[PDB]
């Protein structure tokens, strides 16, 4: 096992240099481990995936539609922690209750557990493969359908990718256990959605086209995003051939009446079409809004475990289950199960204290109605203003966000569009530009990178258009994109990229990998180089992964299919000159030591002898500068007057000719052999 | 498996808890190694050992008396550090310079490297075997005679033991390569000296009867310890058969005029008897006094290496050598040789900062003439007052020493008489007692142990008698010792004592260990007990011994019997369940660890 | 309250930044107050100064010769601490036992209490006026003659001065209490010591010409500093009309027979002349040497209190008093007074632990006969040379101090000669140059200033000149001297300095200050700048001066009689933006604080 | 008052009180807490650098309480007794 050494080299690197990942809150994990409820030994109860496998997506949508009562999709495994814990939740922790959900939550419509921020976060920060997580969870949950969030053309990154790679992404995702593809586009821009839909379509999965939601449909005066706007868009997507239709309320902007008005009317134009509604609780109106959707006849609602709900996450599962009983809406989910599911997560959440948004955010905020920052951005921007800075500098960010949105011509804000607005907001504050003042200077302002690419249409054409007098005098000489980006973008090779992955990262490279390097060339590179050094770490428990082991603590670890390793950290020595520390472990009762580098201690006048150069005769203060900086000298001619204490030295030179530069001027103490003069 | 194990357990125990031995002054061993000069390969030049073994003690004596110029004795290996560095110098540091002494100081009358307190502390504070020091030095110096200091009737120690013990001590000492026995008695009690002289004499080896010197000879108004007292004492000893006669001035009370008066008179009376003289430099007159001795025709005088001299030590070796160049008295000892020797010791002394008297004592003091406190003692009592106190509590102690002296009959003050008077002195200052108050309350005060034993007869009879006003009151009829304590004191079973030690210590008992047990029953017990746990420690250098290694530095252990241990101390852990730390070592390229208990689970 | 604000400012500055002056050995002054003996009221006994004042120098000379027995100079107030404690002894401490010395030492020839390095050090390091020290001890000691050490044309400096300055220096010294001017020249260069002599004569002080002593008079082969060499020089000095002749043995090179040789052939060459002999004890022959001088009819000898003697200092006054009792040479100084004076000095010596040479040097060394380093200088090189880059293998320094000697023409090494030899060796140290890689690699190199200046004749001509081939290429076209430095030196405009000092260093200024500024232009500048900022600190307790107050520990400081300031230090604040800390005091029950600058933390 | 660091001892200063003049171990419990102490009576015994000391009295009246135990380390002025 060279790979026991690699494990140790990592654990030592942690407990010498501290939490190796960016650690946002100065907090450590819980000294307690999540409670995993007892599970039955057999196969689980039949869920919806048995229906999906037997009838296809067309059959499955019929089964969903016909289910009288309300169906839930749990988002704890993805969206919940994307908002609350900077997407930091690792496969280890998800695997622990996988058996539990299988057995106890067979009734769920699907179970959101992939896509969105999880894809890069897994590799970028957690140093684990997102395909491995999908695969492993699939062997653990045979019965419940899996669901992912797919950003239309921007697939799983933050811009439009070449047509072919988006199609291939869905094929291998499907092949891995991915059933339901929720497909959206930050600007409700049809072409990009059709593209996403036929990527998921022809891969065989359940297609769920998702309209992104902004403004207030209940508010008559706001014309831009009317009930008609949304109605015309669904009808397009239905014509395009979706299985389920989703309303993606990413900012938590959906209130009871607006739901009643919208879902009841969507139920009208589409009598038997499954409606899946997704909201965020950041205004405090999540639960109520969902019960409205229930009443207006929505088939599926998004919830999260209690301990992972409220604020910028989804609404509480416990609440929808409770407020739904004794009504035609009944979920038929036992409360005891919800309690226990949530209780595990209360404990798991505890491990992620370093990333818990709750450190500065203790409530929802109704001002989402004014600024419209989606759930995830809100909290991963709110943090930015109470942590690295302090307090109210977030106010102006929000005030600039409002202004930026209308500067870009009133936008639907989801990823990436939301990121664009937030980038222009940050920019305006970063150098004090008010909206109107930014407008007049846009001619030569030099804006962020994401904002200028947007106005070229790398991400597409928003409803309405580009706010005109602005767009033109930002670009002025830059290529625009007409219509859909993927149309001109040449099909990206996937076999000349295979050859490179064979080169840089040895022979054992799967096709899953290929698509990751396509998706995240440099994140994948830094990923594969880490797992080269420290081996695979997706098997450690999270406290050990983030914090390292405690001194004298005796702990257990197994490395994927290999036997158990009893370990104790014993001591970590002082610094050697190379800036390294020796770390001592009891491995299997056997004593072992590791050299590791101390970063905090890695970040830790001239003499010339055998040459024509002149060094100082004695260590002394310089009281006289004699030779004009770069002038002639003679046979034994004074150049410098030095004085330590009671001792002086008039510096002479037999060396004649020109002089180079003068090193020291006046005052400070000069060492023994130190820099004075060169002579040609 | 145990050997390097015990060695790593020692070195570990130091690193974690500090020195296992008392550290009186809180300083660290000097970081720079002592400079040992280059030395010729092969045999050293002819010494006096080459004349002793051949011609016999009386021939040696004759050669010494015939040698025209002045002869010297180096006290560096004993009396010197016994005064300046608390007797702490270890066999290790002695050996490093032994070869240089053989090759360059062949001209020495002798070499004092044993006896006095060396025996005691080597075992008590150093855990070195005092005999091992003897033989190892003997093996490194064949040419120069070895001199030791014998406390007359009690060999080494401070209390008279049975007569066979002393008679055997010498037999063995001689067989282990001791040549000259300097024999003295604290009271100048002639029966106690004769005991010593016989035990030494009949063991082979030179008999040097040492008269202890007090008062002032050149001051006629002091009649008790007058020129006629010493002459007469010296008469009796010569008559009893001395090889060399010694005047032992343990306190440095010997002035120049008092010298030539005494030496002239000993030369008067005995024209062809070798005179060996010993002083301390406390008064600052040692050099002058020895030069006055030399001129009145003394054969031998004592010196220490400059850098181990002055103050309560012997006079400077260099000073004596230098002041006789171009004189009939010439030492013929080449000066370069003394420079390099003195410079070795400048380094060695460095290692012993923890015990260096110059912590408190910056010079000698002419007040010895008043208090008569012997060199060694002056250092200890000085330290005890300055170190813990407020400086001037010493004035009181020594002005109480003066009184204790004339209270107890006006005594000669060497070991153990000086312990006795010093013990009476520290008694009088624990209770604010005048000489007049204390002896008016003599009846009950219940004085310390050693005083009551002195006044009983345990060390013998002072000249002048006991103070009978004062002594009877203390004693309240207890069994006063009749004659010389020796005879009236049954012999100690050396056979029985042999087996006694074996059932716990083992088959590894040499006859030398027995005499050690006979002398110091308890400290020899604790010595082996320590050696049992940590192995023989005399092979390490003193820095390692006293303060352990330091993290990250590789060092080779001069471990005997031909195998070298490469050790690099790596790290100490923090405390655990059982209040210990784990020490990490590299041992011949192997990663190794042991557990040592931190004495802090011992402190709460 | 503004005179006290400055005091608080100083005491904060010490508390924050450690001691103001360079402290070499990282040690603290002792917490024990030195013991001062009680002294009877009214006048002291009449001393030699009464014979001096009433009979002029001529009579004093005669009275000293007529005193049969040995006369003494206590040297503790100047040379003794220049040798052992880097001349750091403050007036405060000198002043304390001054009443004692006055009453109990009237029999002294004189007391050495001024000149030498005390002038420089007092202003540079102790921030005390040396002129004050002289006047203030004068009021306390009316009966014993004061004695100076004047470097001839060198005065109390390191190079030769214009005649008018040297002359004027002696006048105001006379008028401030200087009685005896001991005059010497580093190179024994006759004209230079003739200058200082007449300048001392004009002033009307006792003129003590001193022949600096190098070599070994008892050694026949040494044909450079022969017995006749000194005889030649003495004849000239006596013929020039000195009142007293002195032999200055700066490096402690006098051996007993070399004394016997020189003082007997001086006594037998000038029967009427007072002979004053000065030595150091670094070799350990000091007492013996001095006793040989007395025996060969020397009138006066130099000693230091026991606790400030030995090693690199003067010989023990205890020893010469002791070894001289019951002898024609009897000093008649009572021993009980020698004890008390020494005891006080032990107390005092401890206040200077940070400057104490014994931290590195634990004894005298006989190897002065090799390196010929004077008393003062043998301290100021591994204890010192800390300024230029510490010590590291000091052997090599010395072994090139020996080469430097031969290198400059084999010289009499005193001040400033020895300094020049001590600047050449240190130069060869940090540049790692051998004597062979210097005599030839001479022109292509740049030696120190003191060397270049000496070579061109700034401080006189050595006996036998400079070593020409070396001398030539160092100087290379630099202007050489033309005989007596003073002769060809232009007189320094003392009146134009007057108005400069008044316009610059405060308004009303004394004529003494003019002579300070003359001797040391900007050591005086830095001194006057300091006291202006911090007030007069000479009034202050030594432990207080060196390390400041103990937090929470109440104390008294009277700003010279008049007022009583009860002070207590309270706390020290964290650092403010401006790099300062606030410091809180209780001043007469009233809360008081200042803003001081933190050196360490000030580097922005 | 530092509560946080009141978990100890004492060194009771100027007024008529009994502390350690020498830094050493505590060996004695001679006087009872509440016993008559007339003349200059011994109360306590310390032990330092191979030394032993007898703790003085010159104080009349009655003892409040012993503050020392046995084998106790003593710091500065310290807390031996108290008389009134
Ligand atoms: C500097 O701070 C004072 C001078 C110290 C050096 C002293 S002066 C007298 C001795 N002679 C010599 O050349 N140096 C010694
Ligand atoms: Mn969401
Ligand atoms: Mn002795
Ligand atoms: Mn001198």
From Swiss-Prot, chains B, C:
Citing just one GO molecular function, the answer is: metal ion binding
Question: Any idea where this protein resides?
Answer: Mitochondrion matrix
Q: What class of enzyme is it?
A: ligase
Which amino acid positions bind substrate, per UniProt? 78-82, 151, 415
Pathway terms, separated by semicolons: Carbohydrate biosynthesis; gluconeogenesis
Report the EC number(s), separated by commas if there are several. Answer: 6.4.1.1
- State the UniProt keywords alphabetically: Acetylation, ATP-binding, Biotin, Disease variant, Gluconeogenesis, Ligase, Lipid biosynthesis, Lipid metabolism, Manganese, Metal-binding, Mitochondrion, Multifunctional enzyme, Nucleotide-binding, Phosphoprotein, Pyruvate, Transit peptide
Q: What is its main location?
A: mitochondrion
The domain of life for this entry's organism is Eukaryota
Question: What kind of modification does the protein receive after translation?
Answer: Acetylation of Lys-255 might play a role in catalytic activity regulation.
A single BP term in Gene Ontology: viral release from host cell
Record-annotated residues binding Mn(2+)?
79, 248, 278, 280
Q: Which cofactor does it need?
A: biotin; Mn(2+)
Q: Which residues carry this modification: Phosphothreonine?
A: 510
Q: Which GO terms describe its cellular component?
A: cytoplasm; cytosol; mitochondrial matrix; mitochondrion
Mutating residue 117 to T: what's the consequence? In PC deficiency; mild
Show where the Pyruvate carboxyltransferase domain sits. 70-339
Q: What is the effect of changing residue 90 to L?
A: In PC deficiency
Q: Which residues carry this modification: N6-acetyllysine?
A: 96, 168, 224, 255, 399, 476, 499, 568, 597
Cofactor remark: Binds 1 Mn(2+) ion per subunit.
Substrates-to-products reaction catalysed: hydrogencarbonate + pyruvate + ATP = oxaloacetate + ADP + phosphate + H(+)
Q: Which residues are reported to carry the modification N6-carboxylysine? A: 248
Relate the assembly described in the record. Homotetramer. Interacts (via the biotin carboxylation domain) with SIRT4.
Which illness does the annotation name?
A: Pyruvate carboxylase deficiency: Leads to lactic acidosis, intellectual disability and death. It occurs in three forms: mild or type A, severe neonatal or type B, and a very mild lacticacidemia.
Q: What is this protein called?
A: Pyruvate carboxylase, mitochondrial
Organism this protein belongs to: Homo sapiens
